Scaffold this active site. Structure first.
Site, mmCIF file in Angstrom:
data_model
loop_
_atom_site.group_PDB
_atom_site.id
_atom_site.type_symbol
_atom_site.label_atom_id
_atom_site.label_comp_id
_atom_site.label_asym_id
_atom_site.label_seq_id
_atom_site.Cartn_x
_atom_site.Cartn_y
_atom_site.Cartn_z
ATOM 1 N N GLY A 28 0.865 -1.164 0.000
ATOM 2 C CA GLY A 28 0.000 0.000 0.000
ATOM 3 C C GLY A 28 0.902 1.214 0.000
ATOM 4 O O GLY A 28 2.113 1.065 -0.153
ATOM 5 N N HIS A 46 9.840 -3.438 -2.835
ATOM 6 C CA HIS A 46 9.277 -2.656 -3.931
ATOM 7 C C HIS A 46 9.449 -1.187 -3.567
ATOM 8 O O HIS A 46 10.010 -0.400 -4.332
ATOM 9 C CB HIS A 46 7.783 -2.974 -4.132
ATOM 10 C CG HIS A 46 7.170 -2.286 -5.318
ATOM 11 N ND1 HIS A 46 6.161 -1.354 -5.204
ATOM 12 C CD2 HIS A 46 7.433 -2.392 -6.645
ATOM 13 C CE1 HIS A 46 5.827 -0.917 -6.407
ATOM 14 N NE2 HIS A 46 6.583 -1.529 -7.298
ATOM 15 N N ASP A 47 8.969 -0.839 -2.379
ATOM 16 C CA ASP A 47 9.059 0.513 -1.862
ATOM 17 C C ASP A 47 10.459 1.074 -2.066
ATOM 18 O O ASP A 47 10.659 2.070 -2.766
ATOM 19 C CB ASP A 47 8.723 0.486 -0.380
ATOM 20 C CG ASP A 47 7.261 0.717 -0.115
ATOM 21 O OD1 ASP A 47 6.409 0.030 -0.724
ATOM 22 O OD2 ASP A 47 6.967 1.598 0.718
ATOM 23 N N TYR A 50 11.527 1.836 -5.419
ATOM 24 C CA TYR A 50 10.955 3.103 -5.853
ATOM 25 C C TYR A 50 11.719 4.295 -5.310
ATOM 26 O O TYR A 50 11.832 5.315 -5.989
ATOM 27 C CB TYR A 50 9.476 3.189 -5.450
ATOM 28 C CG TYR A 50 8.519 2.663 -6.513
ATOM 29 C CD1 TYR A 50 8.885 1.610 -7.364
ATOM 30 C CD2 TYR A 50 7.239 3.207 -6.656
ATOM 31 C CE1 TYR A 50 8.001 1.123 -8.323
ATOM 32 C CE2 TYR A 50 6.353 2.723 -7.611
ATOM 33 C CZ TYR A 50 6.739 1.690 -8.438
ATOM 34 O OH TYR A 50 5.862 1.246 -9.396
ATOM 35 N N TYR A 66 6.820 2.913 -19.010
ATOM 36 C CA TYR A 66 7.849 2.110 -19.662
ATOM 37 C C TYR A 66 7.284 1.127 -20.683
ATOM 38 O O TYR A 66 6.078 1.008 -20.838
ATOM 39 C CB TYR A 66 8.658 1.347 -18.610
ATOM 40 C CG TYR A 66 7.826 0.679 -17.529
ATOM 41 C CD1 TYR A 66 7.489 1.358 -16.360
ATOM 42 C CD2 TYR A 66 7.372 -0.633 -17.678
ATOM 43 C CE1 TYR A 66 6.717 0.749 -15.364
ATOM 44 C CE2 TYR A 66 6.605 -1.246 -16.689
ATOM 45 C CZ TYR A 66 6.280 -0.547 -15.538
ATOM 46 O OH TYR A 66 5.499 -1.136 -14.580
ATOM 47 N N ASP A 92 8.843 -2.962 -10.704
ATOM 48 C CA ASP A 92 7.500 -3.512 -10.776
ATOM 49 C C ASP A 92 7.497 -4.991 -11.140
ATOM 50 O O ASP A 92 6.715 -5.772 -10.585
ATOM 51 C CB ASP A 92 6.646 -2.744 -11.796
ATOM 52 C CG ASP A 92 6.414 -1.293 -11.407
ATOM 53 O OD1 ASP A 92 6.280 -0.996 -10.208
ATOM 54 O OD2 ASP A 92 6.349 -0.436 -12.308
HETATM 55 C C1 LIG Z 1 -1.450 2.756 -2.190
HETATM 56 C C2 LIG Z 1 -1.870 2.303 -3.572
HETATM 57 C C3 LIG Z 1 -0.776 1.412 -4.119
HETATM 58 C C4 LIG Z 1 -0.133 0.104 -4.513
HETATM 59 C C5 LIG Z 1 0.622 -0.814 -3.596
HETATM 60 C C6 LIG Z 1 1.101 -1.991 -4.419
HETATM 61 C C7 LIG Z 1 1.932 -2.764 -3.443
HETATM 62 O O1 LIG Z 1 1.675 -3.601 -2.396
HETATM 63 O O2 LIG Z 1 3.252 -2.414 -3.773
HETATM 64 NA NA NA Z 2 4.517 1.017 1.071
#
Ligand SMILES: CCCCCCC(=O)O
Ligand code: NA
Length: 118
Positions: A28, A46-47, A50, A66, A92
């Site tokens: 999220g 992932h975070d 980013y 992309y 991603d």
């Molecule tokens: C807050 C809306 C976003 C996507 C989160 C996707 C995930 O768990 O990386």
């Molecule tokens: Na997050």
């Protein structure tokens, strides 16, 4: 691209979108506390991916578009010349794959702000 990311998740798993929108401590927007299980660990990384992406000039992972390809469930990143497009696509891609691999615990679905993510 946030929407393309949705599709990688679609292209590589059985679990739907809202399934990840808010799960554990990191899946999220933003993250707090220590990851819950390994699916949440997918979101943690992932975070961080980013955050690093942001270190590229004019690079907004969240809105960067992309070039990628999907063939259920295999997905490919065709970016070569655009360093941001590729770094974000791999970000991603790695997530989607990570998700499909991890188990889905239904008790972690909404433990956010509930105290374990200090
Ligand atoms: C807050 C809306 C976003 C996507 C989160 C996707 C995930 O768990 O990386
Ligand atoms: Na997050």
């Amino acid at each position: 691209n946030l929407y393309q990311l949705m599709n990688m998740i679609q292209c590589a798993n059985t679990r739907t979108w809202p399934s990840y929108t808010n799960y554990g401590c990191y899946c999220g927007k933003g993250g707090s506390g220590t990851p819950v299980d390994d699916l949440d660990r997918c979101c943690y990384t992932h975070d961080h991916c980013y955050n690093d992406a942001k270190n590229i000039d004019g690079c907004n992972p969240v809105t960067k578009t992309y070039s990628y390809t999907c063939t259920e469930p295999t997905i490919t990143c065709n970016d070569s010349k655009d360093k941001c497009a590729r770094f974000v696509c791999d970000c991603d891609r790695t997530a989607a794959i990570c998700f499909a691999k991890a188990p889905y615990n239904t008790s972690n679905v909404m433990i956010r702000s509930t105290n374990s993510c200090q």
